[PDB]
Design a protein around this ligand. Structure first.
Ligand SMILES: Nc1ncnc2c1ncn2[C@@H]1O[C@H](COP(=O)(O)OP(=O)(O)OP(=O)(O)O)[C@@H](O)[C@H]1O
Ligand SMILES: N#Cc1c(C2(c3ccc(Cl)cc3)CC2)nn2c(O)c(Oc3cccc(Br)c3)cnc12
Ligand SMILES: N#Cc1c(C2(c3ccc(Cl)cc3)CC2)nn2c(O)c(Oc3cccc(Br)c3)cnc12
Ligand SMILES: [Mg+2]
Length: 1192
């Protein structure tokens, strides 16, 4: 025993470990246990000392036995099973060995090298699960054999031993536990003081060799004694009650303290040589206090730090130099006259246009000290985590700190829900290079001489597996702790050279955030950033307003009240519109930065202003920033009241009028320069242009309305910004996708709409995006890429769109040989434009900038509560770029205007009784007038009643039925009038056509009893107004002639009146596709018996469908399509009637097939069961009809 105890002590002394009794006990335990078992399990907290334990035991054995030690360390859960074990390829049988088997192969077959004279230690340092240990269960059994799907058995020699280093056994089985030796590290192995001594000596190993001995000794004892005092321990005990973010235990922060202290002290070595002891001690103390401060309290929220400073100044001796939060040391005049000063703030003289330089920042004390500590921590070669609320200048501080530097270049990697290690490596590929060396296997240096910083933003979102392992965080742990990784297709080790890791995060309490592993976070210097105190925001924005008001110099004095109004508005918005109403009510200071850039642009491209104009403009900007996202009229009304209050407080001027969102239409369309133009003139301009647009493109009947023109102006404001991405939330059947096309047409943008269907995959969405990006860059084509939620049928599409809007590229699209090709194309393009760039970076910057100004992505979303929609809204890459617009739903006034416009064209015979009714009711639902208003009110009231009865609770209630029934009522009324071309019959035609149009539009999916209740609640509305009717009306007898009545039964229709009404609805619809939901198969026969041999039958599951359907429309055939609880989005142009007009022809894009419609075509859809979901696109265009037998 005694010899092993001695060898252990020697190993620990060489490593600089303190041979604590607990450390000794655990080392001896591990030494004895490994003698009779091969599968060891070591469990404990992060930082227990387990890795130190087993490495020290290995070295002790290396001394005592004289045998060699080969070690392999595998962070196993970064890898997949296929990458660890082997697999089979697509068809080739060739077996890819996988890492663990490849090393076992080398351990056995080699017969060259001292593996027989070596112990082989394969360490699986990660959290373990059943699947992985199960895939190797035969290695733990007495077979001691690795069995492979390849049918071969690999015998393991006695030399091969396995260590499961981990932190938890929650998901491990007793079956494995009972075959292993379990070692539970029930405590930390060493003292805080001894860990400090070890860390000191470790850094001395680096710095001592460079430094000359005379300085070296005096310095290292000058630090050791002061740093080792008891009071510091007192301080640690006074740490444990402080409110740390992320919660790393005090034992795991010493690394940060020692490295930052030693780095700082060593930075002044060239000066220190002249000082007296007193001044030197002072400087040493002050640096150690500053490093202790930020090591222990840097994760605390400001006040804690200023309060903790008092404790540090109290528990150190009062003679020692006092520490203040602002204190910084500056080398004044000659060497050694250091000055401890604060607020050396440079005054920035921003020119007006520099308001929209994204690299700019205001020199504020907070930012100065953050940039300071950031760069010190980076220079110490420690990892960092910049945690802070959304919009706490986490990135701005980094960008400023590193932009000035010429040494530390940046890569940005914006995480999402499912980022992969492949995404990280694909990011790295553009900047990095791989070199082969025998000594370092594959070294990965960066592609130059500098240092490289990986800014991994949103690091706490990647979705963990069911065991809780989020593998990318383990990969980043591997990169820090091990300085490398395994390349698993090659199975060789990669050492990283000079690359640094920086994290950024939103606090773990926010929605959707995952608590990261302590094993990971222990390696990083965590810092907290907070919102800049409000007042400092008033100073920052006072600078911005003064800069932009250099364009209007007489108004320079008002920059203070403008800034104060801006922050006052911000603060009250953030307070009153919280996330408890809607999850998208988030407000950062970036809302104000958008504000000042918008106000700038508006002034820059505007005419001469007066103060009245300035206030109007500022109100417009405030509206389009803050309030466009709001839903609820009470919220908009309170926003108006808030605006009035803010302006009354700060800008008390005399000629402000209504500030309503619809009373301040600033435009840049009619006039060359941006100014508040008149609504009438806008109306007439939009009418003529939209008519011309419809004539030039397709035939869509749309009636101009004031909401439409407002939303037009909002989309124009979006599309004219340099990098404006819009998102249009709201219902279906409300013009989104045609308004965006219209405004794109006005702006001369190209339009793109992805053509994805039931089989399109990632590869296809990749070809779409590569096409778009190549047009935007090489052709400069300025494309409006329109996306709908239906297009992202898997989350991979959403991750790519996140990468796009987060950056201005997809690295994965241009990797490898495609990168070399791309580089060649850009060289040719640039030289064709006469600007010449040589090195890859310059051209890629040009590339990315051209994308960033020539690509506008617009997301329509029909129902926000859908899980896909919720993911798109919740995506941070989308949310922090997309101007959110809430179109929502149509109001009563808009419905009345649209209805009145449609009703006015139709002739209306005078009816004597329509006037005396007016006096009576006074419900106040439209100005009292004539039949036109009476009809409008009846339609609006019925639509409201119907959406009460259907049980549709919140917002999925598009105006589709309203528009369709209104259009069908013109066809009825004017047809019946032609039939009439009596004195008791003419006037009830109105009521009967009202009823008829309603049955056509609303009744098709109602049960008989629901139809009865509708009929009652309608009938009362007619008798509620002047609309008399046939009291004995019957829909069947009114609409269906006796010949048709028989003809259907001859075709085999069931003699049930409910079926007769349904058949009337489906045959009487013109330009609307019936959707026949009949599980009882029979309809697909009655239709065929009616139309005869010329009835084609098709299916979404017959994979020849698309070509045969094109053929069918070429023939003018009737078509029925089976299996409706399936849809193929390529057919949408048949369903949503649209056809690009031609002179001679009338054409439709059925995919890329620009097919001419043979007129006589008729589409029916059928479906076999009501449990099949109907996509909302179909469900709001298509006439849904149910033949299902009903018990009622
Ligand atoms: N006897 C000792 N004397 C001095 N320092 C020690 C001693 N034991 C452990 N340490 C210090 O504690 C540190 C953390 O322990 P170790 O590196 O083994 O982490 P770990 O327990 O393996 O945690 P993880 O689960 O994160 O891998 C060591 O780097 C070392 O600096
Ligand atoms: N322009 C700007 C901008 C500003 C303002 C600013 C504040 C202080 C100073 Cl001295 C200068 C400017 C203009 C108000 N703050 N600000 C941030 O906080 C950011 O923080 C992030 C970064 C990445 C992800 C997430 Br989530 C949040 C990003 N940009 C900004
Ligand atoms: N005709 C027509 C048309 C209509 C209606 C209409 C509305 C306003 C007016 Cl003035 C006239 C008619 C007929 C009810 N809505 N509508 C859209 O919503 C469109 O964009 C989409 C498409 C799919 C999903 C989503 Br979400 C948006 C494109 N065209 C139309
Ligand atoms: Mg370890």
């Amino acid at each position: 025993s005694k010899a092993i105890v001695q060898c252990l002590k020697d190993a620990g002394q060489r490593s600089g470990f303190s041979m604590s009794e607990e450390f000794l006990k655990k080392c001896m335990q591990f030494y004895y246990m490994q003698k009779t078992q091969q599968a060891l399990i070591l469990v404990g907290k992060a930082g227990c000392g387990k890795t130190a334990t087993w490495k020290t035991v290995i070295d002790a054995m290396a001394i005592f036995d004289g045998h060699a030690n080969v070690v392999y360390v595998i962070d196993t859960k970064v890898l997949t099973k296929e990458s660890l074990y082997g697999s089979m390829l697509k068809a080739t049988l060739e077996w890819r060995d996988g890492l663990f088997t490849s090393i076992l192969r080398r351990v056995n077959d080699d017969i060259t090298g001292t593996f027989k004279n070596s112990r082989i230690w394969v360490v699986f340092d990660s959290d373990l699960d059943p699947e992985y240990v199960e895939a190797m269960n035969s290695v733990l059994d007495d077979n001691k054999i690795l069995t492979l799907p390849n049918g071969e058995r690999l015998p393991i020699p006695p030399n091969f031993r396995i260590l499961f280093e981990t932190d938890n056994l929650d998901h491990t089985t007793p079956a494995t536990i009972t075959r292993c030796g379990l070692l539970w590290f029930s405590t930390d192995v060493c003292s805080i003081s001894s860990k400090i001594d070890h860390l000191l000596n470790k850094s001395y190993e680096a710095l001592d060799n460079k430094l000359s001995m005379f300085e070296l000794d005096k310095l290292k004892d000058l630090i050791s004694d002061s740093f080792d005092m008891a009071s510091l321990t007192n301080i640690f005990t006074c740490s444990n009650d402080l409110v740390h973010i992320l919660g790393v235990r005090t034992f795991n922060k010493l690394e940060t303290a020692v490295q930052l202290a030693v780095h700082l002290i060593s930075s002044y070595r060239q000066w220190f040589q002249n000082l007296d002891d007193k001044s030197l001690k002072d400087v040493i103390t002050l640096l150690i206090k500053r490093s202790l401060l930020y090591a222990l309290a840097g994760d605390s929220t400001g006040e804690s730090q200023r309060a903790f400073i008092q404790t540090i100044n109290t528990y150190f001796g009062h003679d020692s130099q006092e520490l203040s939060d602002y204190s910084t040391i500056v080398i004044a005049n000659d060497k050694l006259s250091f000055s401890s000063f604060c607020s050396e703030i440079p005054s920035v003289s921003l020119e007006a246009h520099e308001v929209m330089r994204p690299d700019i920042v205001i020199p504020t004390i907070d930012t100065i000290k953050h940039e300071k500590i950031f760069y010190d921590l980076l220079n110490s070669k420690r990892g960092i985590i910049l945690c802070g609320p959304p919009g706490s200048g986490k990135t701005m501080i980094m960008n400023n700190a590193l932009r000035n530097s010429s040494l530390y270049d940046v890569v940005g990697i914006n995480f999402s829900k499912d980022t992969t290690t492949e995404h990280i490596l694909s990011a790295l590929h553009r900047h990095t290079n791989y070199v082969t060396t025998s000594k370092g296997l594959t070294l990965l240096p960066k592609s130059d001489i500098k240092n490289l910083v990986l800014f991994c933003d949103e690091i706490n979102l990647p979705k963990l597996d069911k065991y809780g392992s989020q593998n990318v965080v383990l990969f980043l742990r591997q990169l820090m702790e091990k300085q490398g990784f395994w390349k698993t297709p090659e199975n060789k080790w990669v050492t990283i050279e000079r690359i640094h890791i920086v994290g950024a995060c939103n606090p773990p309490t926010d929605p959707g955030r995952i608590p990261m592993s302590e094993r990971f976070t222990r390696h990083a210097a965590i810092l907290y950033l907070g919102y800049p105190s409000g007042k400092s925001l008033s100073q920052i924005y006072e600078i911005y307003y003064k800069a932009i008001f250099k364009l209007v110099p007489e108004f320079r004095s008002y920059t203070e009240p403008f800034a104060r109004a801006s922050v006052h508005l911000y603060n009250e918005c953030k307070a009153r519109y919280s996330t408890g109403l809607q999850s998208h009510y988030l407000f950062s200071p970036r809302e104000l930065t958008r504000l000042v850039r918008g106000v700038y642009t508006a002034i820059n491209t505007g005419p001469r202003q007066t103060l009245r104009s300035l206030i109007r403009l500022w109100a417009y900007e405030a509206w389009r920033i803050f309030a466009d996202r709001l839903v609820g009229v009470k919220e908009k009304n309170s926003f108006e009241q808030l605006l009035y209050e803010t302006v009354d407080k700060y800008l008390p001027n005399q000629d402000l009028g209504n500030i309503s969102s619809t009373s301040l239409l600033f435009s840049g369309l009619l006039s060359l320069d941006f100014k508040e133009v008149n609504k009438t003139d806008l109306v007439n301009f939009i009418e003529e242009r939209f008519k011309t647009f419809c004539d030039e493109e397709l035939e869509v009947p749309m009636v101009i309305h004031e909401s439409m023109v407002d939303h037009i102006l909002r989309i124009d404001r979006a599309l004219k910004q340099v990098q404006g991405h819009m998102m249009l939330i709201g219902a279906s059947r409300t013009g989104k996708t045609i308004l965006t096309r219209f405004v794109a047409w006005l702006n001369g943008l190209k339009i793109v709409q992805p053509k994805i269907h039931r089989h399109s995959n990632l590869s296809d969405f990749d070809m779409i995006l590569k096409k778009a990006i190549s047009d935007c860059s090489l052709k400069e084509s300025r494309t409006c890429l329109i996306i709908d939620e239906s297009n992202i049928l898997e989350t991979a599409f959403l991750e790519r769109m996140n990468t796009l809007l987060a950056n201005a590229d997809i690295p994965d699209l241009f990797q490898g040989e495609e990168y070399d090709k791309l580089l060649n194309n850009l060289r040719n393009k640039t030289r064709s434009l006469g600007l010449l760039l040589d090195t890859e970076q310059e051209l890629y910057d040009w590339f990315v900038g051209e994308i960033a100004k020539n690509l506008h992505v617009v997301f329509t979303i029909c129902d926000p509560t859908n899980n896909k929609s919720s993911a798109m809204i919740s995506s941070p890459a989308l949310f922090n770029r997309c101007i959110i617009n809430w179109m929502g739903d149509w109001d009563t006034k808009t419905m009345s205007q649209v209805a009145n416009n449609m009703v006015d064209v139709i002739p209306m015979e005078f009816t004597d009784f329509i006037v005396p009714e007016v006096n009576k009711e006074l419900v106040f639902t439209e100005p009292i007038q004539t039949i036109r208003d009476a009809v409008v009110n009846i339609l609006i009231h019925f639509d409201r009643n119907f959406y009460q009865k259907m049980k549709v609770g919140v917002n999925p209630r598009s105006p589709g039925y309203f528009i369709d029934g209104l259009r069908a009522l013109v066809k009825l009324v004017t047809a019946k009038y032609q039939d009439l071309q009596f004195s008791k019959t003419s006037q009830e035609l109105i009521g009967n056509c009202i009823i008829s149009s309603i049955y056509e539009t609303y009744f098709g999916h109602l049960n008989e009893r629901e139809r009865a209740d509708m009929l009652v609640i309608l009938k009362r509305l007619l008798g509620k107004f002047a609309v008399k009717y046939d009291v004995n009306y019957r829909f069947i007898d009114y609409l269906v002639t006796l010949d048709e009545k028989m003809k259907w039964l001859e075709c085999g229709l069931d003699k049930n009146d409910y079926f007769l009404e349904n058949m009337s609805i489906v045959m009487n619809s013109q330009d609307a596709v019936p959707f026949l939901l009949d599980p009882s198969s029979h309809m697909i026969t009655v239709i065929s018996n009616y139309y005869g041999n010329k009835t084609v039958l098709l299916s979404f599951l017959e994979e020849g469908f698309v070509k045969r359907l094109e053929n069918a429309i070429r023939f003018g055939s009737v078509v029925i399509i089976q299996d409706g609880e399936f849809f193929d989005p390529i057919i949408s142009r048949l369903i949503s009637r649209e056809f690009n007009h031609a002179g001679n022809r009338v054409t439709v894009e059925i995919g890329d097939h620009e097919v001419d419609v043979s007129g006589d075509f008729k589409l029916f859809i059928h479906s076999c069961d009501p449990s099949g979901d109907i996509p909302i696109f179909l469900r709001s265009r298509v006439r849904l009809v149910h033949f299902v037998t009903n018990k009622e």
